[model samples]
Target: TARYAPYVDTSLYPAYDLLATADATGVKEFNLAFITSGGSCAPLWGGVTDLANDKVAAQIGALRAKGGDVRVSFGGAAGHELALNCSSSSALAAAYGKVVDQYKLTKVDFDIEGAALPDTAANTRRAQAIAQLQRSHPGLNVSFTLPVMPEGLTQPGVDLLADAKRNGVRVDAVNIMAMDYGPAYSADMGTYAVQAATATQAQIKGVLGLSDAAAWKAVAVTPMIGVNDVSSEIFTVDDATQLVDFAKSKGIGWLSMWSSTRDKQCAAGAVNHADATCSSILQQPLAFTKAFAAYK
Candidate 1:
């Protein structure tokens, strides 16, 4: 991500809205796609259906036709990451290749979180497949999306990146989920966002023997917009601005939020279902997008 592109969950809303809203707000491209219902094996569009001309893909086509793009994301907190289901490196590579080929994507985001971590066999095979995919399609951007603390990615997360490099998987970016810092670091989302990326950037630098600029270029951060899964956390539009400023100043690769689906706020006094309709915090429509749009 040489630029900022927020992760917009594809199946959450109508694709037309997803595109038009971004265009209107000026964010343009989004990191679309999610763990398809295919449940990691024979993955289809969101694992929901195999119809290529479905509502969203067609809308995606409409957007691309107008000079926009999508950075397909795979795996999520509840998702059984594709690697877990595929037993072979070649199988996993082919699975990823299908999605990339479908979207003709230059880059893809892998959101391995929650239980998706701590998989030895899966991580090994995942690295092998990643290398194969990259080698087979040279210049295809492959990025890892992991959860993070202000201090840095957990050791396992670092190991995953290391495994990728060791297996010849060229990691184009290490974009961390910079939210839900629990009790210790819950106070400042902006600071944590910057800290998380810098930590990973530094890790990539030391591990790959790259310069600071190179390291920064390979680091990205995605903060959860508005309220997070952690009830105590509530990333606001102000936090978004601060995080975006941090990204620009550091010359980092990218900045994103939890979603466009949650871009708006709930009713003035609801408990915030934390579902699709709103951002679970007080906000006007497209507030985060407007803030992130300033990233240049």
Candidate 2:
């Protein structure tokens, strides 16, 4: 498993070249963002870019040539998650299977957030489908990316894992979206991220019944680099270093950021202003990526 894997926003403007990125930064593993529905239960990147015969496959091939790979992430802050639209668990499983087959993926992430988080029927269907998927792909690593506070997961987040466990889905990791917690958590983003991971360890222990070490091993943290959507929150390079130290001590399974595309400093905008293309802070490129890459 990768100790550090930052996300790549596949749908971003001026599309990021996965192979080129791996060549530039030592960070090899990446979590490709958002595979949502094109129509029915069919998977599409960002609900728009078709995966079949796509350029991404070639890019992924090139990245793998250099000892790099990626986790296919489904769902995001927007768009219809397959689970929500798929009428049956079997159909959902098939849709997920197709994506895995298309990419030859060994790792997949379900990013349940926004509207996707509150749908009970969809969540249950997702759990059952994932159980089926895991059964078919024995060695696959499955991760769930959920919103969190410094204290821990919300009741809904806990419920999702409990549902997954009941459905016999072997969750490999629980990655928290450790950013945009508003002004209350704005004081220290890194501390809040660590606190969130610590609390999640306890929650995983309760729901998944793993030992402390195992629970820590199952935890993953993903912070938005520099300015977050919530204007007050900013995850600096210093914060990334501290988080990396926490991961080393606790055996945190993974570390990631909002996006690799935003890893570079803004050229002209205010440092505090948020941007999808660049991190609104004074910093060298890939600083956060380098910090987490040193974990292993």
Candidate 3:
């Protein structure tokens, strides 16, 4: 729902109304409302313009009113490239401080895909930015979105978390792009389960360096599934349920779907098989909602 109905340049007031409707229908669980920094780097410099924007404030207020946990996302896959320029440690620190002060947000997410390489000097600076933010805002929640690999763990992904912990950065959780990996995209439940579970365990291990028994107890492993068409292999509800069970078995945090719209139109295996009706998609399904209710 949030993915398709992103409130980027649109009116925040209208977005709030739509979200309210969804919430009323009990489709609001697992609602990860994203508040970007303007378009891209808006979160870096504290994006006063974007934060001070009337609609943004209204949107935040609305979410808070409905008891939603809204986290501000910074440096998306495309917008994050600019963060490379924040190479200086001090510069990165100051920039992060500015963002924290400007938004008064308690949590921040780093969606740095397709932007900074993990081992690059620029990437170090990016890590510094997170560390600095953690230091400045002791209670702030920090999270990231990482890529998955065949071995279940990506070196860069693990390194980033370790470095942050070493530097006293308090990272809250991470969302792994479980389906993006080639084989996982297939409809075969067995293959999907293997890839998804492997990638999930690999991610948890990267963070805590613990075995399945211990890692599952400490970290939150969220598997992200992408939806293109209703009939696509990735849209199977059974597959999603399997992934959810995998997370639950490990005592993982939550099952985060890419977006409410994609889930309604394709992923959740809802009615309108081929062409989804806007009205039908708008109403959240009980089957889909019930599958992950245990997570709450």
Candidate 4:
């Protein structure tokens, strides 16, 4: 199945409603992001909003009600990652399990990046906890969203996957963060994405001990549409189309982007250099959503 689930920053302003986006675009499944540590071994959205809040749950409920579902993502470029805060694997497992029980989720994503990516103890703890979580909840789909380069996953990213396998965590997919490589590779961001996927397939096979076909099934790509954090790196519509064509031909597991919030044009006179609420390019609303959703 070619799953298309873009990430959405839950606590960000001008909130991106999950059900509304699905209704407007053909896109459905979304990865709700950055469930970080509130205090000791507890989960919170963006480190401020409580997980028990009605609004976020209602949005998830509505989306699920309409044949749509969400994968609660833990960690990001910012905030305190739960794995770093929790002292034990059991504590971390309980924290993640709380959210899983709350939403009755069949899928979840751990976006290990920034400081969390380099911490070996945290990585091992996360892997152990995920193994424990999956043991309790059978048939769960777990994905690791990691930073990558056109060449392949960095050493840290590969280590994370290896740790997961060593700890008995069954990884369903590896979603590469195919963005912000700065000006050196700006000549062709789209081609860089495809190259990154190809390289990752080989890396996945090496680390996970899988064949070429199974390696492709475990691969996924996520681009930051339009203007990325680095001003020079812009992922265009042509890039999206090229990526989708490659994904279909290869039979990759999933397709995603940095956000659902930025899938539209920016306002007039506004400087749109990786703006949070809009894509800094010439386009209509939900353009990227429609493009990636076509994978199905």
State the lDDT of candidate 3 residue by residue for 1-296, as single tens digits: 12111212222223334355346454342333333343333332223334455344445555655655345555544334435545476766665566467646676666555535475566666677777777767878776666654455467777766776666665566655454455344555335544654665666665656666655543443333333232343434565566566656566644554443333433444444233221123334433444444455
Cα error, residue 183 of model 1, in Å, equals: 2.8
Per-model TM-score on C-alpha atoms = 0.93, 0.96, 0.70, 0.97
RMSD values for the candidates in order, in angstroms, are 1.9, 1.3, 5.7, 1.4
Write candidate 2's Cα lDDT for 1-296 as tens digits.
Answer: 99888898788867777776676767778998889997778898888888864555447877888998999999988788998889999999999999899889999999999888988899999999999999899988999999999999888999999999999999999999998897766589999999999999999998988998899999999998999999888888899999999999999999988888898888885576789889998878776777777886
- Which pairs in model 2 have colliding backbones? none
Between which residue pairs do clashes occur in model 4? none
Model 1 lDDT per residue over 198-248, tens place: 788878897756788989888888988877777678787888888878888
Model 3 per-residue lDDT at 266: 35
Give residue 45's lDDT in candidate 1 (0 to 100).
57
Instruction: State how far residue 184 of model 3 sits from its true place (Å).
Output: 8.5
Q: How far is candidate 2 from the true structure (C-alpha RMSD, Å)?
A: 1.3
Overall lDDT per candidate, in order of appearance: 0.77, 0.88, 0.50, 0.88
Evaluated at residue 17, the lDDT of candidate 1 is 72
After superposition, the stretches of candidate 3 with alpha carbons farther than 4 Å from their true spots are 1-18, 25-49, 54-57, 183-214, 217-233, 266-294
Q: For model 4, where is the 10-residue window of minimal lDDT? A: 268-277
lDDT, model 4, position 284: 84
